[PDB]
Design a protein around this nucleic acid. Structure first.
Ligand SMILES: [Mg+2]
Ligand SMILES: [Mg+2]
Ligand SMILES: [Mg+2]
Length: 820
RNA sequence: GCCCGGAUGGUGGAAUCGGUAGACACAAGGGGAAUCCCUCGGCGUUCGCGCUGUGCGGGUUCAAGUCCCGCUCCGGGUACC
């Protein structure tokens, strides 16, 4: 065993071992319990950032841990390889998106391997390859045939392909209740995004107008407070008035281009319940695309109605009582909360629900209103006018008819060998490309490409069967691996990717491809990585941001930063810990830290510094701390093994001191197990390891028994660290002569006999304040404990000439003397 | 505007059915570039501890960081639906 811990001489060798033995390659083995650990796949931008490194270390800890529990563990990696940044970079260099993307993939793959992530590399997928994307093309034609796909022109105004995500709104919404191991925050974000709303449509007669106008409201209870209506710029009534009104027409034209603003339509509606004529405005805040593109306005109780009404001198009418039953102060703003009606005729005194229902019922029976459920969720627009994405498998015949690309022309291959002219997709600018023949007649194949969210919506599934032809999924394999047991990635994907992949899963279920409703049991959103951020003010008044690496700080007598400078001598202002970024120049390159300290130190720091789901504060000093710890583990194993083999441990003949150390070993095992497997607090797991290492470093190692005990502890410690720092642990395991490769060694289980106490610490309070802590035989009786407490000078001091009124006793733990 | 989080030493961050607050680590200063034995919330100390202490106020309980009421401050999403 080398005396010196040398990451550079260890890490690449173990890594090569992992590849040579294919250690982390798995099959669909029905005789084992499966566990699918998934991290969100990276975009091949060029290098890993610190967030990839946190995301994938978390995944790797879990995958290696679960393997040591004896599970069959799938941990796959791949590349979300289509998308915009490649087009930018293709043009910026003298190049094409594909070769730039493949270069980034090789470079980043080598970084992942240098970090020693235990992936099943045989399952590796890159989404820009025809072998991957042909399947989403095929599935898209199937989706179209199921009636879930349609073309339509829309804002972004351009034609687009949509997939009917609204056909699954209620399922996406209901099934959120099945997801207890998703965080509330992500669930609430998807709820609001889907935005199912229960309301009322209300129809008005309009003077000098040969239609009726209908609005949608979620607060029909406030309808007696309605003083005007507001319609979207692009509403048929708004257009009918503009015909004779240059002001209005001017306004409508504005509302397309680049904040309460509107115009008086000149039309008057009759309020169906008061008979009063009310104005109709065109207004900027009203979406033509939602509901009916028109609202009834109630300034007294809708904040945006309040602002609009004030601006244009429209009536503000109160109809909701305050929470305390008093008529609302509307001098400043609207009363938003739902309360009892007043000033609403027949509906006065009704509470919120009763009023909602009475007014709905009334307007229904009058035939000018009905209940109506709307959704904020729009259909999913999957089309882009972009080159670097998977072609959309549709064609147009000469007769005009749109249909899917015939099965025998799939995939539709994106040509990789192209030259970007910056502005037009090569497959657009060459009018030859589109030309095809369908049933031996000329057709034009679609020229738009898929939204990149298309590939990331089903990759997690394809990982189960990456080499399968015949179909998108081999069901047997997919149903074996799915659902994902834990999915680790950022909360920022909450209402894009994390919604799309639930939807796509349901689409694949409903094509018979899988047999479960939800793609992922647990979702873990890891916190952001923060770093210190500094800037100075140039003599031009411009803020110049200086990397915290480049900052020379100086500290008071307690270590607070109080003054700082860069090398050039500028005065820096410390702005605290902040999200890593190019704007603030506080990015840290993981590769530099891997090359400086070895991957194990980097990984250990990032798991130690902070619970997975909280923000992590990057500190060079914490990293050097982690590194020194690893040297202390290396040293203690060096010293222990330098003395050769050990006798078998005799557990019956241990000193009270030995029993105590061994109890601490096994309690640590229990605690680390609980922390990693149930609580998922990896920071406290690691702290328990360090704490134990500190004790082990202080224990004697001369006697045969001390050495046997040290062997047992080191074999446990080395396994406990292994999911965090597997390169050093793999090596140390061999030094200790552990059986086999550590990657397939069993996770240590705590020995119950080792955890038994002969003694217990009893905390002694007097009137609830700690006056002593006594060690007593583990089964001492309450009388024995009391007697011992009263023999303590520290306690007796507070019993002297005062009377014990009563005692509270928690067996073997606490005695409080109430006195007196 | 809501939706949660949160607030504990000089800093990060513990405390898992209320029962030894501050584990673990960093900074820092100090003793014997790298290493080990310490010390370390505050005040006081006869070194045994005493008082005080988890954002402020109050309640509950023999006992509150942890439960309940009310403040004050703060981070991060996110809206004309
Ligand atoms: Mg924690
Ligand atoms: Mg504080
Ligand atoms: Mg506790």
């Amino acid at each position: 065993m080398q005396e010196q811990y040398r990451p550079e001489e260890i890490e690449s060798k173990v890594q090569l071992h992992w590849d040579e033995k294919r250690t982390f390659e798995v099959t669909e083995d029905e005789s084992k319990e499966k566990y699918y650990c998934l991290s969100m796949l990276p975009y091949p931008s060029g290098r890993l950032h610190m967030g990839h490194v946190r995301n994938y270390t978390i995944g790797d800890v879990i995958a290696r841990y679960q393997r040591m529990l004896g599970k069959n563990v799938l941990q796959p990696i791949g590349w979300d390889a289509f998308g915009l940044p490649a087009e930018g970079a293709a043009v910026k260099n003298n190049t094409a998106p594909a070769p730039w993307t493949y270069d980034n993939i090789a470079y980043m793959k080598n970084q992942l391997k240098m970090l020693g992530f235990g992936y099943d590399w045989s399952r590796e997928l890159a989404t820009c390859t025809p072998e991957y994307y042909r399947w989403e093309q095929k599935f898209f034609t199937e989706l179209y045939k199921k009636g879930l796909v349609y073309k339509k022109t829309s804002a972004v105004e351009i034609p687009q392909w949509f997939i009917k995500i609204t056909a699954y709104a209620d399922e996406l919404l209901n099934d959120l209740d099945k997801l207890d191991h998703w965080p509330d925050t992500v669930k609430t974000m998807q709820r609001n995004w889907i935005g199912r709303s229960e309301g009322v449509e209300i129809t008005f007669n309009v003077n000098d107008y040969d239609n009726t106008l209908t609005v949608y409201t979620t607060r029909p209870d406030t309808f007696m407070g309605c003083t005007y209506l507001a319609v979207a710029a692009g509403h048929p009534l708004a257009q009918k008035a503009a015909e004779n009104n240059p002001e209005l027409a001017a306004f409508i034209d504005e509302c397309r281009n680049t904040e309460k603003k509107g115009v008086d339509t000149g039309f008057k509606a009759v309020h169906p319940l008061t008979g009063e004529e009310i104005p109709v405005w065109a207004a900027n805040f009203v979406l033509m695309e939602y509901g009916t593109g028109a609202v009834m306005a109630v300034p007294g109780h809708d904040q945006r109605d309040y602002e609009f009404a004030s601006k244009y001198g429209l009536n503000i009418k109160p109809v909701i009582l305050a929470a305390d039953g008093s008529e609302p102060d509307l001098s400043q703003q609207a009363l938003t909360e739902k309360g009892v009606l007043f000033n609403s005729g027949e509906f006065n005194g009704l509470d919120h629900e009763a009023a909602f229902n009475a007014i709905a019922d009334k307007l229904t029976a009058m035939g000018v209103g009905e209940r109506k459920v709307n959704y904020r969720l729009r259909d999913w627009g999957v089309s882009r006018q972009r080159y670097w994405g998977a072609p959309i498998p549709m064609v147009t015949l000469e007769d005009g008819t749109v249909m899917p690309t015939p099965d025998d022309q799939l995939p539709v291959i994106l040509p990789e060998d192209v030259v970007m002219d910056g502005i037009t997709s090569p497959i657009k600018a060459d009018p030859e490309w589109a030309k095809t023949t369908v049933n031996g007649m000329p057709a034009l194949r679609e020229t738009d490409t898929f939204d990149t969210f298309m590939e990331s919506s089903w990759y997690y599934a394809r990982y189960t069967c990456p080499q399968y032809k015949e179909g998108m999924l081999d069901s047997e394999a997919a149903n074996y691996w799915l659902p994902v047991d834990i999915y680790i990635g950022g909360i920022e994907h909450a209402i894009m990717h994390l919604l799309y992949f639930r939807f796509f899963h349901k689409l694949m279920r409903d094509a018979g491809m899988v047999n479960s409703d939800e793609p992922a049991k647990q979702l873990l959103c890891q916190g952001m990585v923060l770093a210190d951020a500094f800037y100075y003010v140039g003599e031009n008044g411009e803020r110049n941001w200086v990397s915290p690496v480049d900052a020379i700080v100086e500290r008071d007598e307690k270590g607070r930063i109080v003054k700082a400078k860069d090398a050039a001598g500028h005065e820096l202002v410390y702005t605290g810990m902040s999200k890593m970024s190019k704007s603030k120049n506080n990015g840290i390159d993981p590769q530099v830290m891997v090359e400086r300290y070895g991957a194990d130190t980097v990984r250990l720091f990032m798991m130690f510094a902070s619970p997975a789901d909280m923000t992590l504060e990057w500190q060079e000093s914490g990293v050097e701390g982690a590194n020194r710890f690893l040297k202390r583990v290396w040293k203690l194993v060096y010293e222990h093994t330098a003395k050769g083999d050990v006798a078998a441990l005799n557990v019956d003949a241990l000193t009270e001191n030995q029993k105590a150390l061994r109890r601490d070993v096994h309690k640590t095992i229990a605690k680390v197990t609980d922390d990693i497997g149930r609580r998922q607090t990896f920071n406290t797991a690691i702290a328990a390891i360090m704490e134990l290492m500190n004790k082990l470093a202080k224990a004697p190692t001369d006697g045969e028994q001390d050495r046997a005990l040290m062997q047992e502890a080191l074999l446990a410690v080395v396994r406990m660290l292994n999911p965090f720092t597997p390169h050093i642990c793999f090596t140390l395991w061999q030094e200790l002569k552990g059986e086999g490769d550590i990657d397939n060694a069993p996770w240590p289980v705590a020995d119950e006999k080792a955890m038994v106490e002969d003694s217990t610490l009893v905390v002694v309070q007097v009137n609830g304040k700690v006056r002593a802590k006594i060690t007593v035989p583990v089964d001492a009786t309450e009388e024995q404990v009391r007697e011992r407490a009263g023999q303590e000078h520290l306690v007796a001091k507070y019993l002297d000439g005062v009377t014990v009124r009563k005692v509270i006793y928690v067996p073997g733990k606490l005695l409080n003397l109430v006195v007196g």
